[PDB]
């Protein structure tokens, strides 16, 4: 019944551009709005938020401030926030506008990367490799304290699915924090059905759950158009099943689909995949 | 049994999709030689001629589809009367109308394994195109245009309780309502992902255990476009080559398949005949080829 | 040493989207600003003009974006700066010429495109305004488009040279023959060679006091520029285009330019965005030696 | 303006040592809208469908198919219609020329092909009849092929112009030099340019009362025509071929034509079938303006 | 579990047989994917010994000469208590690798990860390609000079072999597998059991071996994941299944030598297969995603 | 005159580019069989071994050692009145080829067919890559050990060089070309004059030379025709223009040595570039279409 509020974040910042600012346009090009309207939802496209050691800190901070304020307003209006990226640093703004509305927000971090870096552990200084750490209260003070509170989330309320690119500092933190992580090894061993059932078990006491889906979580064969492709990822079929299972559980209260990069895509295969996954997450069925 | 190969170079509907070249591409991948090497007697009955007609219409190319399907039903009937195995090559999926018209009257309870991205359960009322290749399963169930439903003077050819759809991922609202109303057994990609192809085939064999014959209607578009790019209407997120190969080996071991058609191969979207070669590999597995 | 003022137009309007709103981002991704600075130019990136998303398709959004573009191009010229517009669909030529033409007594236009874009609603099988900007700029078409910025026509038919045409409908052909417009289709380029085509173009426009280059990347062959809104087979090569830009720089006649219709959806690793930057570099004086 | 009805005949023939996929050529050319495009140009078009196709490889089948083709082509010429034959392997030129040559006092032939197809069983490394049709038509080869339709030879060596040759064996080279046959290899196309090659071809065949074009898509470079039976690197470009067809149309000398050797197996989304249709359109008078 | 051994890398740029297949460029392409730097970053001491010069049975003399040099180099690496990692090159190089390795173990196990069984003799081979015969040769079946390389035979026993990924076996190879009782996981068994169970069963089956050699042919993987191989065969093992199998073999601590063979840049796409070979070596040597 | 083929599997510099596999890919396209079929006596001398090993000049010791071995082998071929045909490999091998060749002529001419001028020194090079310096080194400008290879300098004079296909020249290279008066046909001049006129002018310009070396970098061709090169540069010479140029050089009878370098199988499409190199060598040695 909730209206879907779509917010685009054409952010492509860091040591070098990767082409992900074009992600929102490519997702819309795959008919996102019409597909959600056809499913019976009231859809409001709020358009794109304007975007200008720690690369581009001021621009990352300003865009995330605008995103946090817009996501906060959507939640206050009892609407579902759907954010399109854009580099994964936008999770800083999305979680800042969302977490204060829940006593115990869960986060499903669907990505090849853990994005748990600080400037001390990052081989690049890229803020898009730090948003999960920042949201857990670890990192640059201005990013950690966005919107005047911290931390946004607790490590026991995070589940990472699809991880296959973690540096030494990120691995040390996951082990020390006891964070729940399904690397490609456990997806291969358990199967996506059991990974999602266990993820739903794990986050069962959360009063809201945010899905932060990076298209780079999928294998480059299925999602070639991403900012930083990593070999050996989740299939389209496994991702489609996961979105169907999340819809059936009724636990997802916010979501962002990020890192779509038309420069490396093939005739918008990745933009189309993002829309198919959003449709499944919002209740579309094959029968 | 001797294998009787029948080609149907049919590519009809609102627009061509390139599938009339399917039979040629499957033969190019050495279908006849491969079956002969496995020890079968193989008869290539060649291609049935498909009537060309001028280039609005409600049912697209109706006259040419009925005519081609009448020629096919008569040839398939003759093959079965001779106790030979009919292997039909397509061609658009509307050829299932003629294959089932020539086959179903030889059984009291013919089962059908519909291996396809599409349910092909449309009528003109539910079809946004009038494409008869989107209606053959409905026609064979006795639902649709009178001349198509009554082909060979009997209807219906099959009963809904004797159909299993495997790989479905593109169904319109009219097809979904019919599947739910009829109680038809359908394994969408969601069920294949959750159960695994081994369980899907085991359940299919149990479900059709009261049939006296089973027809396999295999649309190469049931496979994912990564494995079968050369199809008339590709749909993302399909069955892998390995799952399809295992399915054919399991169907061979069960010994239930009494007829088969391999359809919708389209050389225009194919990569160096990957899909024609895949069709031959799947036919070899269905007919008993083993890796060891 | 004239400052280059870059304006992005992320416009993708018409019966259906074609992905050309991402053109400005792709051209900038190929380092346009850094390449022009390295050549010794002062470069001012004025950013992207905001465009509203989707008979005359998207008339209100096409008019609104072109109004913003026209007054921005006007200011650049009033400041004695070179306007470089990045597209975006070719309908943005309506705004570029509206902001430029009033500054010249006889503005020349080199329309480098597979399409003539000489349609009206009466000759257009789609109602797409991006297939009408040259006709609109010549004073033929919808009143609100033709009278943008309060004057019409922007240009005269004797001051236009079309180069690379290979997709002209019957209405466009009829107008070309009746107006006596100078057109070098791919047949003339094949027969004369690009050197002769550009020498004849410079001679034909020699009396113009300014010359605008409207370069649609679809003028190039899809093998060289696959990433365009509407690709048409059998186009101009990269080498022919590179030579043309070098000859135009040497003539010193180009006073404004737009590079339009870049489409990342059909591109291969930004080959077309990179090509756009190389052609801009050559037009602005980059030499191989 | 050719006020003649076009008669399209398909020859889905793929014979020889091994199949090459060219039997699918006629279907792929029709898939690229051949009939609709010619009708939209104002021609009356009749699709006569495909002739059924059941040491010298497959001699009986090549003979049977060419006999049916010769009879059909003969009927079209008797009806004062233009025969347009779609292949299929190049051996179909035996039947096309058998049905055509007897209607002319001095039939010219433009053989547009990477191959000369001037082999006999003695000079052929394969025994493929599709590498022998020009020799057979000149009265050199197997008696049943040479005597098809009860007359021989169909054509005289001084009435042949080969364009695009780049795969000639020593027997073919010896015959070309001894006969004095006019051949424009890729070397001569590189040195002269296509305009001059076609102007010279028109001068050379000006005394012929009819001219047959036998266009093998393998004459084009595999970059432009990847979907052919036997691709050979370094061929004619799409633009050179488009210009050549426009110039043949302008001369008004072409009285029959065949477009052969399209092979979907090696093609990319029917680029070669589409190219065949574009070349037919230009040969029949389509202009860009 | 931590292998405190130096890795000795040996390249074998061998591409012999009825026709070249491009696999001599395999070692260069694997090195181009940063093999040495990746193993060094994991904390291993790595010594690149470079490439061995490769100067009816196709090219028998050249196959023998190259395998003789390889066997002597592998033997010296094992005498030095280092881990031999051989890069191919055609699969005939397994003859030299096993000749230099088998004499150092009482019961050497072999995991043959390949679309092909390579169990041919001249009698069962339609080509005479020695690269289709190295497993038979190593079992003591074949041409005397190949079987007796380094003066002993057989190198391995049939009960100590596990073939994983087989999908191209001729009639002579099938007959031998059934008569010898050799353990073979065809793609049909992988589809039915899943790679986890296949590797668990493999480890149990080879538990009495005192060393285990992995002979990994990149053609064992599906051509969609490993297009750049000498002889691609449709319907192979996925990159993910192969990555899981290498991780499981590392956890078992049984692999004592390994060869990665048949990488072919001619059919590859921007070195996807050379990169895949490096990732599989990294997992085999203990790299973990977490 | 016998053709002596020498391979240089050298891929040195700041980063590898895959060109060490160039000689193997060219041979894979049947180079030796094609030249033998044309009636030539052909001797394949094999590949020179390249020593395996932040410095200013990248891999200097290995580049010098390889070029010393190449110069001695090329010198021997010329002393035997044989035609040296060198396969690369990175373009730094021109240092060794010209060192072994230039001393046999009064005034050696050089046709430098390349997207790059390769006229850098360490001071003008943003990488320290010696493969961007071989023409300057051979003109006697650069590092002492490279310039003095084989005990004489310079190998060639600037008035005896013609560059064809240039489209990537840095400021230091442009300044030297203008100050030395060197003859350079950039893509602009090829587009304006046509390849027939370019080669006719080149033949007239080098008519006083008693020998002419062709240094052909496949990157001189457009990446659409030669995708498999070490450093591709958009807007290059077509295969057809290059084929015509080779036929014209054969007819002139002036080419007394040649090298075909920078083939990179990693970026190639089913050896399109290796096959293109063989076709160009065939035309340079007299192959005709009729
Ligand atoms: Cl049809
Ligand atoms: Cl109906
Ligand atoms: Cl079910
Ligand atoms: Cl789907
Ligand atoms: Cl097959
Ligand atoms: Cl003969
Ligand atoms: Cl043997
Ligand atoms: Cl080194
Ligand atoms: Cl220096
Ligand atoms: Cl070759
Ligand atoms: Mg991320
Ligand atoms: Mg990521
Ligand atoms: Mg179907
Ligand atoms: Mg279907
Ligand atoms: Mg335009
Ligand atoms: Mg245009
Ligand atoms: Mg021919
Ligand atoms: Mg030919
Ligand atoms: Mg093997
Ligand atoms: Mg193998
Ligand atoms: Mg160079
Ligand atoms: Mg170079
Ligand atoms: Na792309
Ligand atoms: Na294809
Ligand atoms: Na490749």
PDB file of C-alpha atoms in Angstrom, chain A residues 9 11 13 51-52 55-69 89 92-93 127 134 140-147:
ATOM      1  CA  UNK A   9      22.041   9.909  -6.634  1.00  0.00           C
ATOM      2  CA  UNK A  11      27.444  10.415  -7.528  1.00  0.00           C
ATOM      3  CA  UNK A  13      33.534  10.416  -6.717  1.00  0.00           C
ATOM      4  CA  UNK A  51      26.040  16.381  -6.983  1.00  0.00           C
ATOM      5  CA  UNK A  52      29.201  18.532  -7.496  1.00  0.00           C
ATOM      6  CA  UNK A  55      38.875  11.983  -2.009  1.00  0.00           C
ATOM      7  CA  UNK A  56      36.037  14.515  -2.621  1.00  0.00           C
ATOM      8  CA  UNK A  57      35.075  14.586   1.121  1.00  0.00           C
ATOM      9  CA  UNK A  58      33.126  17.903   0.827  1.00  0.00           C
ATOM     10  CA  UNK A  59      31.145  16.733  -2.259  1.00  0.00           C
ATOM     11  CA  UNK A  60      30.442  13.305  -0.667  1.00  0.00           C
ATOM     12  CA  UNK A  61      29.306  15.034   2.585  1.00  0.00           C
ATOM     13  CA  UNK A  62      27.056  17.611   0.798  1.00  0.00           C
ATOM     14  CA  UNK A  63      25.324  15.044  -1.451  1.00  0.00           C
ATOM     15  CA  UNK A  64      24.783  12.626   1.465  1.00  0.00           C
ATOM     16  CA  UNK A  65      23.364  15.477   3.599  1.00  0.00           C
ATOM     17  CA  UNK A  66      20.757  16.233   0.857  1.00  0.00           C
ATOM     18  CA  UNK A  67      19.990  12.489   0.459  1.00  0.00           C
ATOM     19  CA  UNK A  68      19.595  11.960   4.256  1.00  0.00           C
ATOM     20  CA  UNK A  69      17.128  14.892   4.476  1.00  0.00           C
ATOM     21  CA  UNK A  89      29.115   5.997  -0.551  1.00  0.00           C
ATOM     22  CA  UNK A  92      25.979   6.924   4.278  1.00  0.00           C
ATOM     23  CA  UNK A  93      23.114   9.337   3.405  1.00  0.00           C
ATOM     24  CA  UNK A 127      34.912   6.936   0.522  1.00  0.00           C
ATOM     25  CA  UNK A 134      30.994   4.869   8.651  1.00  0.00           C
ATOM     26  CA  UNK A 140      35.946  10.270   9.580  1.00  0.00           C
ATOM     27  CA  UNK A 141      33.920  12.186  12.246  1.00  0.00           C
ATOM     28  CA  UNK A 142      31.931  14.367   9.745  1.00  0.00           C
ATOM     29  CA  UNK A 143      30.738  11.234   7.828  1.00  0.00           C
ATOM     30  CA  UNK A 144      30.099   9.167  11.032  1.00  0.00           C
ATOM     31  CA  UNK A 145      28.071  12.006  12.655  1.00  0.00           C
ATOM     32  CA  UNK A 146      25.963  12.895   9.588  1.00  0.00           C
ATOM     33  CA  UNK A 147      22.494  14.125  10.791  1.00  0.00           C
TER      34      UNK A 147
END
